[PDB]
Every structure is written in structure tokens, then in C-alpha cells.
């Protein structure tokens, strides 16, 4: 039985704003280096030789983009499938597509491109896989889902997951979310028929993975009042019971909004997902081949550092950089081209392409976008984003929210830069 | 035993076993007569400044060796590599094989009152390995003491016939040991047709059904894969691969394409 | 061929790895008596290794050495076997046999991979006695190019090196250490060597003996109490039997503790192995290949009331006593041979520059 | 025929993830089998394009992955002998790739005898009813360990790295042999060094200073046995030898991912704590003892004779 898998791009329960305009929700750079090929290489990391990668929007960029990877060619394990932007909007008519163009056999991966993380996946697929061998295939699907704490920074009320489920048959129950919820309460008619016991468990993040053989295109065809997996999986479990693994070690999470671009921006560095951590260089880029050193830095090819410029968790720069003098930068990444000058702070920026800072500049918590000649005393605090081309100049300040860019109504500016309030 | 003309020639190859290494030699038991046990020599494990003893041979593997030249109270019994400098090897390991298989079927002719303890072997070897220098080429006698034994190919089997033909060996040890190897090879299809002129291609599609079923022998379609069966192919002959290979892609390349449908590797 | 020598009293619970002996029960006990089951100069140089008659430091090879050429220079040569190789497997038994007898120095490995590696370059195509005769020839130039040029060319070398009132300690039993104290002391020099030794050898003799012969000023001081020549040692000359690949040195129970105990006083150890002693195997600890000689020899004398008579009478009481001993190579420093004066580390860089190369 | 380039980067690519295969010298064999085809259709005409075709396609197989050497000493072994073969050649074309592939059968025979060598030269250290240790996981000291097994009576211990306990796994190995070994946790390396006699560690690089490069805990068993000064005999065959140095960049260590060492089990706390881990350590050249090697014994500062001659410092740069 060969192993491929559909990869979606998007699922349109929009959180990103305005980051989704030039560049899409999935061309993210998050170390200089583009998701897709982060997501991508999570699927060859894993062997599955064949997948779809689906999209819907600006078919000319990410037409572009994957004409200069080394997987455009078939050389190596991968050939991508990509198709171009008819009536797409989400999973749905994914799955519609992927049951009415029928390119599955059985017992695909069903991921967003979206997910980056380090599980060898078939540990389970060939559990799953007894389960429906033996068992008359009353089993539908296997879920591998974390094991964490009730306090993590990936586990922000989002995607927050309690699941009631037992443990010798390890079956689910209850796929009940807490979005706001706070008292609890289970449906009692289904414990007398196991009376030995069950357990409940809220040690879990859903890592967006599962596997799906194509049952789910029966189920999800026919029941069209299923769209998104979470009420299709409920609308499974009132009526087929599906299965459940605890995985012990390894981690991903779906970097939905940009509290978990926070959260694996400062993982892949903290570096929680080896072999992915980006020195390894996945695409063939010169431009990004980049020197580990003590305390997790890392600096890029002709660096030009400036002088007393400290360094202590977690940086990059990239690639024709020019930092300046006395840099205090933690926990941060840094693209490349950048005329970052003398003097300015930093405090886990996420700098992007084609920016040259001004002198004598705190930047904080912030994350920014190409050609932006950000100018003095732009101090800003948590949750700050600034983007695409937009200028500020002699300390425009930015309180905890800023949905700001260079089109007029998303942002907080005109046709014109920043430069006056 | 494995040609009783013991003493081999002068240039040629052969193979050993290394049983037990000497204070200074390695004194290597010689198989392709019982059991003596020769030797090494000194220059050539190399044509240049290697000079070392251990890291070349094992306790217990084997090599191909190389014999200059061996008398017989002169003392040069000589076991090194001299000058496969373009040259072949492993053909002498094949024919090692071939003659331990030999020896395989024959050790065991053993008859059923079990004399292990000393029945004369050459009684039963010597007889049966006689005439078998009926041409002068020694990788011919390779290929015609393999053709020995495929005991239906030499069907001209008198001189000597022991028995009124080959008797204890061709009851079951001739048929016995036939050691055929063979690899399962699953070479698929996906052809479809949609039209009018697919009506008359999805009959086409049948009638392909039927065509790799009767015109050029692929054996035993079923019916296992409900949108898309399997035709079979397996080596007793292994010219079977090109013939289904070139008669699929003539399939693709002129009966597809007159007919306006869909299919490819 | 032989038999083995059999076991006297117990054993410590260690060196179960090695055998002990006696000197009240030998080898020829009972074997071939007229020696033709092996040649008669092994049982000659094995019975009188068991009695310690020639324990020197290449003494020991030069006896192994006339045995062997009186086993060499008078050798039948057998036919149906070949004209090279009927010596060397033959000559199995001789050192299976002088390993029985009391086990080898290194030294005459060293022999012993010498003559093996002559015997080879002289195969099949020359008639036996010419041949014997050209083994002689080179048997003969090899002793005596390598041992005696060694030791007059050391000789120049180290009157080079050590000048006036250079107070020097041997730890001395050898034909080496009180030959280069001789052969400096004769040509206007002054220095006052002492010498040291050991309980149950008692030797320090050869060399004290042939100092005094020779007219040199003694002093004498037991490594039971090595504490006292503490302060006052000048430079040491260390008598070694074999020199290992490490950089290590290699002699007795006696040079165990002065090497360390003058490593802690910056006074530089200087031992002496000329080209024949640079051995291959390299060992680490001291208890690995080391003899041990009959345990009973290290008795009292207080009046008769001696403790170690009848020491099998009561339950677990043993005895035991080392011989050889390795010394690390953080300590020696300084060896004396031919081409220079090469240092500890860098041993082996001049034993493959005299190893056909 | 050109069907080559597709394995020397499903190579590299298996390279990138972590590294194929499990075990240690199987790595050595996959790669020289991998570098004997280097020259299959891989043709030229003189022997300087031909080293230049080494010299790019050897650096990309280096710098694609860092972190080993086992492929880069060898392709510097390829480069070095065909450039010596020339030179004996001329004192152009015809006779070299014939004795090129000779060579290569030469030392890859060799590379297979090398731990029944190691096997074989073990039976000169250890005595009866004393104990012994060793840390961490090697097959070339357990094959030391079993062949004294099955010559001696002793009493090993061993003390385990335990980021991963690579070591528990020895630890049940050595009682089916029947030695009766006792394992402690690494936190008495000091507490039973008293009553240690001897510990011997298996390597997995040694420098061009000859100083090693193993596994976690090796630094600390080093400078915590000389505080008995017990000799630390490391086991090394003469294929895992680098001519590198400590100083080219960092990743001389390996990082890894760190939930080796913590679990998702805690509550709130790992938010800040910034873990890290290195599986490999660094051990100065100067406290080590002797090589249990493939040519036999050597001092630990020997070293440089022998890359003398295995390599030709020009092109150890490459």
C-alpha cells in the first residue's frame, strides 16, 4: 500500500490580517526560509513520495516560488501537484475535489500546509492500519495528538482540547472544544456501557496530522452539513468510533494566529524539532546557508557585525546584512538585505526582506515586512505589527494593537506612509 | 574431489578458506582437493608499500587467490595476488559454487542404510565424473559441468550409466535439486475510455481485457482490484518482460490514441 | 612437545592469569633426558633460566642467542619438507618451551621477530649449508652491529651529554647502565654514583662490584627506604629491559616508585635501551604481562623463629611477589640511544624508520 | 548511463535526517561502497579535471552535512591515492582506474577486518576479580568487553549517559554472557571511583591533535578518573580518524532536540527556561593513555605520522 497525502493550504476561519495580501497565508518566511518548504519537508521527512498541495490564491506568486525549489524536478523523492485557483475556498471542496477527481486508494495524511514538526509518522498509520484489518473497519480514523501540560504557550485557548476517551481501546468520546467554556459536563448515558471505567483527559494540542482513509469521503460527501474536521468529528461521535494515540516525545502545532508564530519562531531555535532547525539549508539557496554557534546564534554568510553588538539566545541575520553598534537582540530573527544601522535595540523582532533601519531605534516584539526604511524611535511593546513598505518616521508610536499596513482601511494609514498622524 | 587432477596450473585463479594464520604465514586450507593446507606469500597482497598482516585476512572468510607458479619440494605453494589488473574475478567463485553445489547433491548419496562413517566416495564420484573433459576450455567445462547436472539438457546421458541410467541420483536427486530462482514482478495497467468513441473504446477496454488475456500471453488476470486489475509475469524464461513490455507500449502508442482515451505507466 | 611445571602452595585471588613455579621441582623432572625431543640447548637454557643463572638484560639474549645458533649451526635438514619453513614451525616448541620454562623479556621477542625475518629472506633456491652459513653471517652482524655499535656509540654520545660532579643513581643490575658509568668515568671524569636495590634479588651487585673494579666512589641505599637519597639525587640513570610503544620504559619491582618519587622533584629520569629494545606490544596496567618467581623465597632470619615455614598449615595465609613492572610515560623522559637523543613520546617514529622502509 | 546523481543526494538527503544507518561502522561500509562508483561514467580526460570533479562533489558532500566526517576523511583517502597513483605513473591516461578500484578492494577489506582486530587484541589488559567500567555505547568495546567475557571472570559496571540511556542497553547485554555486572546511575562516577580499577571509553572522532570527540559524559569520565589516575584505553579503528581540528566553526557538538531531557509533564514552567543539549563532548588529547587500534598500540600525540601518510595535507583542505 503506497502513502501519499493531500496538503491544503487554507482554511478561510481568517486570523491573519493584513499578512494575506501581497504574499499569501503560507508563503510565511519564519526563518528566512518559506512555510511551505518548512511544511513540505515535514512530508519528506516522513516517506511519502507523492503529494497535492492545493491552491487558490495569486496563482502567478506560488507558480513563481516553485520554480526555483530543487523539487521542481523529480530528481529527489518529491514531485509537488499543484492546481490552479477554480471555486476554491477551503477544505470543503477540497475533499469534494478529492473524492470527485479520486486520487486517493487509502490512508492518506491529511495536514494544512500549516503544520511543521518532527513525528515519524507511521508508528500509528500501521496501528490505525491493524485496527482496520482486524476489526471489520468499524474503526474510521487515528488522531496523534499531544501529550502537554494544562499550561503551554501552544496551548492558547484556540485550539484548546479536552477529549474523554478510554485507554486500554483508546476510542474517543467526546471531542468537546473550550472555546470560553468553563464548566463541564459529559452526556452520562455512555458510561454504563463500559463499566469498567474510562478515563478523562485534557493533556493534549491537536497537531492538525491526522490520517484519513477514504471512508471520511463517504462521510464527508454525504453529510454535506460537515465542513471544517471539528463538527464533522463531533457529528461522529453522536451517532464508527475513531481512534486515538498519545504520542510521548516529538511535536508539532498548526500556526494559526500569530501568538503561534511567536511560539515556533521561538521553538525551531530553542530547537525542539531536529532535524528541522535552519542551518541544515533545505532549499538551494547560497543566500541562506547560515554558521551555528554557541547559545543557538546564527550568523549569516558576510555577516558585517557591529562592534559590541551582544548576542545571547536565539538571533539569525541573513544575507548582505549591515547591523550597526550595540544590539541587545533575544529571541529574535533578522532577513536578509538588511541596512540595519547603528544603535538600534532590538527585542525578538521579526525582520523581513529589504529593510534598511534608521539609527538609534528600539524595535520590540515587533514583526515587519520588505522595503521599509523604518526611521527614529519607533518604540513599540507586545503584539506589534508593522508591514509592507509602510514608513513611520520621528517616533509615530504604537500601543499593544496595531493592524496597521500600507492599504487604507485594514491599517491605521492612508494612500501615504506613516510619517504624520 | 572438484577435478582430481590436484596440483592446479601455472596462472590461474582459485579460492580458499583461511582456517588457522601462522606465527609468520597463514597457513590457508586449500579446497579444490580434500584437505591440504597451503600457505601465503610475501611481495604482492598489493602491487605497492602496504606490509601488513592481519587487516587482510580473516579467521574463516575467503578470496581469490592467485597461484604464480607451485612445485612440489621446491616449496612455492603460492597463495597472493599478483596481476588482476583488468581481470575478472568472481567467475572463479561461481565456479566454487557450482562444484560445492556438486558436491552438495553428492555428498548426500548416502543411501538409506546410514553409512556416514566411510562409504569410498570416489566410488560413487569418480565414475559419475570421468568423461566430463569431453572440450578443453575451463570456463567451458564451467558451463558444461553446470550443464551436468540439468539432467534433461544432456538427453544423449550414456557412458557410464551406472545403473540402467542414473539411478539413485535421477529417482529424486537429479529432479530432486533443480534450485530454480525466480522474482515476482506485478507490471500493471489503468486503461479507461469515455465517448461515444469511448463506447466503442470501453468495449475496446474489454477487448483489451481479453487482448492481454489470449493474443500475447499474459496469464491469469483477476479480478482483485476493483477499479483496476494486474497481469502477471514471472521468470521461467524472463523474455517475457520485453514482449508484454513492448506489446503495452504498442497499446499506448497506437491503440489509445486512435480511440481517444486514457492510460499510461 | 613438553610438559608443563606444576603449581607450588596457593595463589593470590588476582593473578589467576598467571602461573607460579618452584626451583624444588623443575622441568627435567622427567622428560627426554638426552635432549633429542627438542635440541639440548633449550633444556640447557631452560634449566638454567630455572635456577635465575643468566637474569641479565641483554645477557638474557645473547644466551638465547648461542643456543640458538647451536641449534641453527648444526640442523639437519629433513627432506619432504622444505628448506626454510621446516625451521620456524620447529622452532614453535623452543619458545612454547622457554615460556614454560620462565616467561621471555621482550628482548628476546626481539630476537626472535630478527631471525624469523632472516629466515625468510633466505627461501628455497640455495643450497641448506651455504645458506646456514649466510644466516650465520647475518645473525652475527646483526648482534653485533645492533648491541655492541649501539653501546660504544651511546657511549660517545652521553660523554657528550653528562659533565662534572653529575651525582647519578642507577637502580643497577645490567650490561648497559655500568657500562656507560665505566666508559665515562675513564676518560677525566668525576661523579659519585649510588646505586639501589631490592629485596628479594638483593642485586645491586654487578654493577656496585664492577663501579668499585673500576674505581668509582659508591654509596648504597635500599628502595624500602628510597625517602633518603630524596633531596640529594643529581640526575638518575634507570636501567630498563624493554622500551614499549606509549613512550613507557620497562624493568622491575625496583624501578617502580623511584621514577615516581624522583618525577616529584624536577630531577630529570634518564633511561637506557638502545635500538634492539623498541618493542610493539603496549601495555597499561601492572599486572598484565608480568612474571611472578617462587613465592617462597622472601623468608627471615631471626635466629630459627622464622614466620614463613610452614605457612600451609593455617587456613588463608598467602604469599606473592611481582617482578617486572611498567612505569607511565608522563614520567620518563629522556631515552638513551643511537641516532640522537630521542624523547619519551616520540618513540616509535625511530622504530619504523628501522623496520624495512 | 548516467544514472548516479540520484543516490549521491538520496545520501546527502538521508544524511539530513539525522543519519542513516543505525549503527557505527555499517556507515563507514554504505559510504565506501557509495564511493567506489564515483568513477563509473563519471569520465574525463586528464587527472586534473577528474580531481577537481572529486574536489566539488566531495565539498558538497561535506558541507551538506558537518556533523560527519566519516565520508569526508574517506573522500580525502580517494583524492590523496589517485593522486598518488598518478605521480608513480608518470615518475597520462591509460592505466589508472583500474588500479584506483584495486585499492579501493584493498581498504575495504580492511575496513571489515577492523573489529575482529579489536576483538582479537583484547585479551592483553584485564585479570581475574577485579571490576571495570565503561561508559556510554560502542560494539567495538562491547566486542572488547565479550571476547574478555569469554576468556575471564570479572565484574564490570557501567555508568550511562542518560540524556538517552544508550547505555541500559549494554547494561542487560553483558548478564547473557553471565559477567554479573552492576549499573549504577552517573551520578556515582566519583562515588565508586575509589573501588574502580580500570575504565575504558569508545570513540567516535579523533582529531588531527589526537584528541577524541565522543559521547556525552567521556570529558567528565576523563577528568574525574584522574582523580585516581586509572588509565582510560580508548577503542578506535583507523576508518573513524579525522584530520580535522577543533577550529573550522562551531558544530563541532551536535544539537539536538531537547525534550530528551525534559517531558511536557511539568505545568507552567518551561516557558523560559531555555533548554540545550549536546550529544557529543570534547576531551583534551593530553589524558588519555593508548590506542586499542588497527595498526595495533599508539600513544595519543602519535598521531601525525599517521596522517603523514593516509592523507596529503594539501588537499586535506580540499
Known amino acids: ?421 | 574431489r572438484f577435478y582430481q587432477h590436484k596440483f592446479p596450473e601455472v596462472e590461474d585463479v582459485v579460492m580458499v578458506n583461511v582456517r588457522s594464520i601462522a606465527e609468520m604465514g597463514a597457513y590457508v586450507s586449500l579446497l579444490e582437493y580434500n584437505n591440504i593446507e597451503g600457505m601465503i606469500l610475501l611481495s604482492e597482497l598489493s602491487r605497492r608499500r602496504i606490509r601488513s598482516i592481519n587487516k587482510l585476512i580473516r579467521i574463516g572468510r575467503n578470496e581469490c587467490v592467485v597461484v604464480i607458479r607451485v612445485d612440489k619440494e621446491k616449496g612455492y605453494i603460492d597463495l597472493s595476488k599478483r596481476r588482476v589488473s583488468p581481470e575478472e574475478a568472481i567467475k572463479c567463485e561461481d565456479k566454487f559454487t557450482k562444484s560445492k553445489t556438486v558436491y552438495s547433491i553428492l555428498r548426500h548419496v548416502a543411501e538409506v542404510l546410514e553409512y556416514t562413517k566411510d562409504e569410498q566416495l570416489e566410488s560413487l564420484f569418480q565414475r559419475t565424473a570421468w568423461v566430463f573433459d569431453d572440450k578443453y576450455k575451463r570456463p567451458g567445462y564451467g558451463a558444461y559441468d553446470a550443464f551436468k547436472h540439468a539432467v534433461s539438457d544432456p538427453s544423449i546421458l550414456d557412458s557410464l550409466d551406472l545403473n540402467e541410467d542414473e539411478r539413485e541420483v535421477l529417482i529424486n536427486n537429479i529432479n530432486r535439486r533443480l534450485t530454480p530462482q525466480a522474482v515476482k514482478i506485478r507490471a500493471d495497467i489503468e486503461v479507461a475510455c469515455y465517448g461515444y468513441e469511448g463506447i466503442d473504446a470501453v468495449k475496446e477496454a474489454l477487448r483489451a481485457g481479453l487482448n492481454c488475456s489470449t493474443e500475447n500471453m499474459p496469464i491469469k488476470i483477476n479480478l482483485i482490484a476493483p477499479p483496476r486489475y494486474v497481469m502477471t509475469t514471472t521468470t521461467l524464461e524472463r523474455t517475457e518482460g520485453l514482449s508484454v513490455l513492448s506489446q503495452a507500449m504498442a497499446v499506448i502508442k497506437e491503440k489509445i490514441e486512435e480511440k481517444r482515451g486514457v492510460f499510461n505507466v | 612437545q613438553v610438559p608443563t611445571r606444576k603449581d607450588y602452595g596457593s595463589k593470590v585471588s588476582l593473578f589467576s592469569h598467571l602461573p607460579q613455579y618452584s626451583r624444588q621441582n623443575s622441568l627435567t623432572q622427567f622428560m627426554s633426558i638426552p635432549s633429542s625431543v627438542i635440541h639440548p640447548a633449550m633444556v640447557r637454557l631452560g634449566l638454567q633460566y630455572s635456577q635465575g643463572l643468566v637474569s641479565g638484560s641483554n645477557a638474557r639474549c645473547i644466551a638465547l642467542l648461542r643456543a640458538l645458533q647451536q641449534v641453527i649451526q648444526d640442523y639437519t635438514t629433513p627432506p619432504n619438507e622444505e628448506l626454510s619453513r621446516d625451521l620456524v614451525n620447529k622452532l614453535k616448541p623452543y619458545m612454547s618451551f622457554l615460556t614454560q620454562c620462565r616467561p621471555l623479556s621482550a628482548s628476546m621477542h626481539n630476537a626472535i621477530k630478527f631471525l624469523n625475518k632472516e629466515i625468510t629472506s633466505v627461501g628455497s633456491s640455495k643450497r641448506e649449508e651455504e645458506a646456514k652459513s649466510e644466516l650465520r653471517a647475518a645473525i652475527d652482524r646483526y648482534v653485533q652491529e645492533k648491541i655492541v655499535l649501539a653501546a660504544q656509540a651511546i657511549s660517545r654520545f652521553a660523554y657528550q651529554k653528562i659533565s662534572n660532579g653529575d651525582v647519578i643513581l642507577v637502580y643497577g643490575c645490567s650490561s648497559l647502565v655500568s657500562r656507560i658509568l665505566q666508559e665515562a668515568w675513564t676518560e677525566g671524569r668525576r661523579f659519585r654514583v649510588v646505586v639501589v636495590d631490592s629485596r628479594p634479588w638483593l642485586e645491586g651487585r654487578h654493577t656496585l662490584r664492577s663501579l668499585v673494579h673500576a674505581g668509582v666512589p659508591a654509596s648504597y641505599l635500599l628502595i624500602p627506604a628510597a625517602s633518603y637519597v630524596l633531596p640529594e639525587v643529581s640526575k638518575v640513570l634507570l636501567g630498563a629491559h624493554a622500551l614499549l610503544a606509549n613512550g613507557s620504559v620497562m624493568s622491575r619491582v625496583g624501578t617502580a616508585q623511584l621514577a615516581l618519587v624522583a618525577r616529584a622533584h624536577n630531577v630529570p629520569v634518564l633511561v637506557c635501551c638502545e635500538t634492539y629494545k623498541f618493542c610493539e606490544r603496549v601495555q597499561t596496567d601492572a599486572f598484565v604481562s608480568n612474571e611472578l618467581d617462587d613465592p617462597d623465597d622472601l623468608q627471615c632470619k631471626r635466629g630459627e623463629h622464622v614466620a614463613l615455614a610452614n605457612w600451609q598449615n593455617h587456613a588463608s595465609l598467602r604469599l606473592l611477589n611481582l617482578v617486572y613492572d611498567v612505569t607511565p610515560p608522563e614520567l620518563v623522559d629522556l631515552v638513551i640511544t643511537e641516532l640522537g637523543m630521542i624523547p619519551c613520546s616520540s618513540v616509535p617514529v625511530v622504530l619504523r624508520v628501522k623496520s624495512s622502509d | 548511463g548516467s544514472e548516479l546523481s540520484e543516490r549521491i543526494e538520496s545520501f546527502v538527503e538521508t544524511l539530513k535526517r539525522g543519519g542513516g544507518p543505525r549503527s557505527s561502522e555499517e556507515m563507514a561500509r554504505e559510504t565506501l561502497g557509495l564511493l567506489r562508483q564515483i568513477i563509473t561514467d563519471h569520465r574525463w580526460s586528464n587527472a586534473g579535471e577528474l580531481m577537481e570533479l572529486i574536489r566539488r562533489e566531495g565539498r558538497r558532500m561535506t558541507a551538506a552535512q558537518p556533523s560527519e566526517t566519516t565520508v569526508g576523511n574517506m573522500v580525502r583517502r580517494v583524492l590523496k591515492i589517485i593522486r598518488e597513483e598518478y605521480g608513480r605513473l608518470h615518475g597520462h591516461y591509460a592505466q589508472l582506474q583500474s588500479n584506483i578500484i584495486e585499492a579501493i578492494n584493498e581498504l575495504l577489506v580492511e575496513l571489515e577486518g577492523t573489529m575482529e582486530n579489536i576483538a582479537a587484541q583484547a585479551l592483553e589488559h584485564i585479570h581475574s576479580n577485579e571490576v571495570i567500567m565503561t561508559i556510554g555505547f560502542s560494539r567495538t568495546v562491547e566486542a572488547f568487553l565479550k571476547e574478555a567475557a569469554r576468556k575471564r571472570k570479572f565484574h564490570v559496571i557501567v555508568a550511562e549517559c542518560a540524556p538517552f540511556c544508550q547505555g541500559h542497553e549494554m547494561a542487560v547485554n553483558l548478564s547473557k554472557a553471565g559477567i554479573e555486572t552492576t549499573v549504577m546511575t552517573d551520578a556515582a562516577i566519583f562515588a565508586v571511583m575509589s573501588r574502580v580499577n580500570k575504565v575504558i571509553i569508545g570513540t567516535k572522532t579523533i582529531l588531527a591533535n589526537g584528541a577524541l570527540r565522543a559521547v556525552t559524559g567521556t570529558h567528565t569520565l576523563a577528568l574525574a578518573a584522574k582523580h585516581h589516575s586509572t588509565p582510560l584505553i580508548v577503542c578506535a579503528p583507523m576508518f573513524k580518524l579525522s584530520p580535522q581540528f577543533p577550529n573550522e566553526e562551531d558544530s563541532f557538538h551536535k544539537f539536538v532536540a531537547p525534550e530528551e531531557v525534559l517531558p511536557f509533564t511539568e505545568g507552567d514552567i518551561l516557558e523560559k527556561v531555555s533548554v540545550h543539549c549536546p550529544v557529543f563532548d570534547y576531551v583534551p588529547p593530553e589524558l588519555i593513555t593508548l590506542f586499542i587500534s588497527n595498526i595495533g598500540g599508539n600513544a595519543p600525540s602519535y598521531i601525525y605520522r599517521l596522517m603523514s601518510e593516509l592523507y596529503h595535507p594539501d588537499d586535506h583542505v580540499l
Open chain 1, 1 to 421: 500500500p503506497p502513502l501519499q497525502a493531500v496538503l491544503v493550504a487554507d482554511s478561510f476561519d481568517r486570523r491573519f490580517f493584513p499578512i494575506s495580501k501581497d504574499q499569501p497565508r503560507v508563503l510565511l518566511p519564519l526563518a528566512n526560509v518559506a512555510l511551505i518548504d518548512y511544511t513540505l519537508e515535514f512530508l519528506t521527512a516522513t516517506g511519502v513520495q507523492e503529494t497535492f498541495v492545493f491552491c487558490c490564491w495569486k496563482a502567478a506568486q506560488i507558480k513563481e516560488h516553485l520554480l526555483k525549489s530543487k523539487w521542481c524536478r523529480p530528481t529527489s523523492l518529491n514531485v509537488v501537484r499543484i492546481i490552479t485557483s477554480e471555486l476554491y475556498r477551503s477544505l470543503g471542496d477540497v475533499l469534494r475535489d478529492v473524492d470527485a477527481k479520486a486520487l486517493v486508494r487509502s490512508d492518506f495524511l491529511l495536514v494544512y500546509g500549516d503544520v511543521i514538526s518532527n513525528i515519524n509518522i507511521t508508528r500509528a498509520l500501521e496501528e490505525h492500519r491493524l485496527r482496520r484489518k482486524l476489526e471489520k473497519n468499524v474503526s474510521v480514523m487515528t488522531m496523534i495528538f499531544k501529550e502537554s501540560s494544562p499550561s503551554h504557550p501552544t496551548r492558547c485557548h484556540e485550539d484548546n482540547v479536552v477529549v474523554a476517551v478510554d485507554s486500554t481501546t483508546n476510542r474517543v468520546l467526546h471531542f468537546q472544544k473550550t472555546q470560553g467554556l468553563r464548566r463541564f459536563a459529559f452526556p452520562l448515558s455512555l458510561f454504563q456501557g463500559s463499566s469498567d471505567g474510562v478515563e478523562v483527559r485534557y493533556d493534549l494540542l491537536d497537531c492538525h496530522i491526522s490520517i484519513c482513509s477514504p471512508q471520511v469521503a463517504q462521510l464527508f460527501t454525504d453529510n454535506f452539513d460537515y465542513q471544517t474536521r471539528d463538527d464533522f468529528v463531533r457529528g461522529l461521535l453522536v451517532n464508527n468510533q475513531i481512534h486515538m494515540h498519545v504520542t510521548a516525545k516529538e511535536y508539532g502545532a498548526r500556526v494559526s494566529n500569530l501568538h503561534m508564530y511567536s511560539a515556533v519562531c521561538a521553538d525551531v531555535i530553542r530547537r525542539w524539532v531536529y532535524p528541522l532547525t535552519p542551518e541544515a539549508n533545505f532549499t538551494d539557496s547560497t543566500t541562506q546557508s547560515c554558521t551555528h554557534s554557541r547559545h543557538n546564534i546564527y550568523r549569516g554568510p558576510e555577516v558585517s557585525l557591529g562592534h559590541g553588538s551582544i548576542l545571547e539566545e536565539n538571533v539569525l541575520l541573513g544575507s548582505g546584512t549591515v547591523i550597526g553598534s550595540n544590539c541587545f537582540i533575544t529571541n529574535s530573527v533578522i532577513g536578509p538585505g538588511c541596512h540595519i544601522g547603528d544603535n538600534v535595540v532590538l527585542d525578538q523582532t521579526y525582520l523581513w526582506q529589504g529593510v534598511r533601519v534608521a539609527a538609534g531605534a528600539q524595535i520590540h516584539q515587533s514583526l515587519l515586512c520588505d522595503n521599509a526604511e523604518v526611521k527614529e524611535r519607533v518604540t513599540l511593546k507586545p503584539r506589534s505589527v508593522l508591514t509592507s513598505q509602510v514608513v513611520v518616521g520621528p517616533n509615530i508610536t504604537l500601543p499593544e494593537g496595531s493592524v496597521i499596513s500600507l492599504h487604507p482601511p485594514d491599517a491605521e494609514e492612508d494612500e501615504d506612509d506613516g510619517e504624520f498622524s
